[PDB]
Design a protein around this ligand. Structure first.
Ligand SMILES: [Cl-]
Ligand code: NA
Length: 263
C-alpha cells in the first residue's frame, strides 16, 4: 500500500511595515575560511553519524553522483556560492531515495558529509506527484510551521503528475516533513509520498537544532519575532549553515506510470 498524503499548507510571510529594518540591522551571513569550514563539516558529520537514525557515508561512486549533479544544478540555476555553506541534496530516483549533505566551497571542490534515506513522490497513484528536480531555497518569504516537528515550506513548485505517462504538470506546495504515525520510518528508501520530501524524525530534529539549511531563516530571526518564535530556543546554529535544497535524479529520469484503478 501507499501511505496517505501529507498536508502541505502554504505559509507565505505576511508583509509587516513595522518590522522593516535598515540594512545595518540585518546581520551578514557568517563567512569562514575553507580550512575552518572543512573542520566544522567533519564535526557535524561525526555528530550526525551518532545522532541521526539511518545515517551513512556513501560509496565513492555514489558520492561523486551527489556532488556532480548538485553542482550541475546550482550552476544551471545561476545561484551563487559566495561563502562556504551546506547544501541538502536529495536524489529522487526510485532506486536511490537518499539525501546527502554537501559542503559547497566557492573556490575548492565540494565535499560530501553523508546522509539518510528519504521518501519522495511516487508514480502509479492518482493525485500523487513526482518530486521535481531543481534548486529550492529556504528563505524568509515563508515561515513554515511546527506539527512540535519542524516543517520547511519551499513554496509552490511545478511538478509532474505521477500517474499520467503523457507528462502533465501541476502545482504542488513543496515541503519537507518528518515521519509520523501515518508515515512510518520503515517507508524511507522507497518512493511513497504525494510529492513532499519525507525525512527521518531524528534528521529533522538535527537540522532544526544545528540550523543546517536555516541561514536566511536565522538572519530574519535577528529582527523578526515571527522567525525567532519558530526556531528552537536552545539551538546551536553552525557557521556553515546554508539555505539550498537541491533535488537531483541520478538514474534514468523518473517516468509517470498509470494507476490501474483510477477512473
Ligand atoms: Cl505508514
Ligand atoms: Na519523486
Amino acid at each position: 500500500s501507499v501511505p496517505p498524503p501529507a498536508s502541505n499548507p502554504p505559509t507565505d510571510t505576511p508583509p509587516q511595515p513595522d518590522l522593516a529594518p535598515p540594512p545595518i540591522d540585518i546581520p551578514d551571513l557568517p563567512v569562514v575560511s575553507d580550512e575552518v569550514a572543512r573542520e566544522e563539516a567533519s564535526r557535524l558529520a561525526v555528530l550526525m553519524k551518532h545522532n541521526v537514525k539511518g545515517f551513512s557515508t556513501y560509496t565513492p561512486e555514489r558520492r561523486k553522483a551527489f556532488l556532480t549533479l548538485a553542482k550541475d544544478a546550482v550552476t544551471q540555476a545561476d545561484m551563487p556560492v559566495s561563502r562556504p555553506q551546506l547544501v541538502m541534496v536529495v536524489d529522487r530516483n526510485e532506486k536511490i531515495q537518499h539525501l546527502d549533505y554537501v559542503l559547497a566551497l566557492p573556490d575548492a571542490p565540494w565535499e560530501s558529509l553523508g546522509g539518510t534515506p528519504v521518501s519522495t513522490g511516487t508514480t502509479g497513484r492518482k493525485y500523487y506527484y513526482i518530486t521535481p528536480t531543481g534548486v529550492f531555497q529556504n528563505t524568509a518569504d515563508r515561515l513554515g510551521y511546527r506539527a512540535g516537528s519542524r516543517v520547511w515550506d519551499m513554496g509552490w513548485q511545478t511538478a509532474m503528475k505521477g500517474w499520467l505517462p503523457r507528462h502533465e504538470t501541476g502545482q504542488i506546495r513543496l515541503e519537507i516533513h518528518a515521519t509520523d504515525p501515518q508515515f512510518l520510518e520503515w517507508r524511507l528508501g522507497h518512493p511513497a509520498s504525494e510529492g513532499c520530501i519525507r525525512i527521518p524524525a531524528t534528521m529533522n530534529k538535527f537540522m532544526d537544532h544545528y540550523g543546517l539549511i536555516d541561514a536566511l531563516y536565522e538572519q530574519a530571526a535577528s529582527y523578526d519575532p515571527r522567525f525567532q518564535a519558530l526556531l528552537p530556543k536552545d539551538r546551536q546554529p553552525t557557521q556553515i549553515a546554508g539555505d539550498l535544497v537541491v533535488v537531483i535524479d541520478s538514474g534514468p529520469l523518473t517516468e509517470p506510470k498509470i494507476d490501474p484503478i483510477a477512473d
